Design a protein around this ligand. Structure first.
Ligand code: 70N
Length: 207
C-alpha cells in the first residue's frame, strides 16, 4: 500500500466540490458514464490496428451496480483501463491543466455542472461519495486498486481480489444522506435524463 499526496490544484478542486453548497449532485453519474464511454472508445480504436488488445474481453458495456448493504454504487466498464503510471502520475498531470481552467470559470460564475468540459468530471464523485475506490486493469499492467476519501491524499495497491480482465470499476462509498442513488427509479431517471445517447449498453443491475 503506497500513499501519495494529490497535486495542490486537484486537492483544492476536491475540497471545493465537498464544501460548496450545490444541490444538483446527480451530475456525477453522467460524468462517470461519459468517462467509461470514452474509455470504451479508446480500446475500440486500439483494436482496429492491434486486434489482440480485445483478448482480455471482447464485450464493450457499462454496468451500474447499487448495493444497499454496503451503501455503494459501482460504475463498471470494460474500457481500456489504467496502468500504475496512469493512477500515480498521468491522471494527476492531465487533470492539473483542466482543474485551474474550471476553478477560474466558477469564480467568474460558471457552475459545477460544467466540470466535464474541463476533463475533471470524475471528481464530481465527491458530491455524493465520502470515499471512492477504483479497481482497474490495463492490457500492459497488473490489477490495481486506487482509493481516496479526499483529505489531500490517495492510495495505490496491487489488487489481489477478483480478476477483471480489462476495464475500470468505480465504487462510490455513498455519504449517509445520499442513499437515493441506490434506488432503481432514481438511477433510471438520471440515466434517461443525462446519458440517453451513450453508444454502449448500460445495464442497471437490481437487488
Ligand atoms: C475519460 N478518459 C478515459 C480514457 N482516457 S485514457 O487515455 O484511456 C487515460 C489516459 C491516462 F493518461 C490516464 F491516466 C488514464 C486514462 C483513463 C483510462 C480509462 C479510464 N476509465 C475510466 N472509467 N475512467 C477514467 C478516468 O478518467 N478516471 C478514473 C480515475 C481514477 C482515479 C482518479 C481519477 C480518475 C479519472 C479512465 C482514464 C482518457 C480519459
Amino acid at each position: 500500500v503506497e500513499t501519495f499526496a494529490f497535486q495542490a490544484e486537484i486537492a483544492q478542486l476536491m475540497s471545493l466540490i465537498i464544501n460548496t453548497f450545490y444541490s444538483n449532485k446527480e451530475i456525477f453519474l453522467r460524468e462517470l458514464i461519459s468517462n467509461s464511454s470514452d474509455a470504451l472508445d479508446k480500446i475500440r480504436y486500439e483494436s482496429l490496428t492491434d486486434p489482440s488488445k480485445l483478448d482480455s474481453g471482447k464485450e464493450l458495456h457499462i454496468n451500474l451496480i447499487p448495493n444497499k448493504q454496503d451503501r455503494t454504487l459501482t460504475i463498471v466498464d470494460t474500457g481500456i483501463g489504467m496502468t500504475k503510471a496512469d493512477l500515480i502520475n498521468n491522471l494527476g498531470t492531465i487533470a492539473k491543466s483542466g482543474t485551474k481552467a474550471f476553478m477560474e470559470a466558477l469564480q467568474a460564475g460558471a457552475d459545477i455542472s460544467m466540470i466535464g468540459q474541463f476533463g475533471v468530471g470524475f471528481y464530481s464523485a465527491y458530491l455524493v461519495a465520502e470515499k471512492v475506490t477504483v479497481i482497474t486493469k490495463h492490457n500492459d499492467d497488473e490489477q490495481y486498486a486506487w482509493e481516496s476519501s479526499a483529505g489531500g491524499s490517495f492510495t495505490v495497491r496491487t489488487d489481489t481480489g477478483e480478476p477483471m480482465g480489462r476495464g475500470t470499476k468505480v465504487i462510490l462509498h455513498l455519504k449517509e444522506d445520499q442513499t437515493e442513488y441506490l434506488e432503481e427509479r432514481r438511477i433510471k431517471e438520471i440515466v434517461k435524463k443525462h446519458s440517453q445517447f451513450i453508444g454502449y449498453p448500460i445495464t442497471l443491475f437490481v437487488e
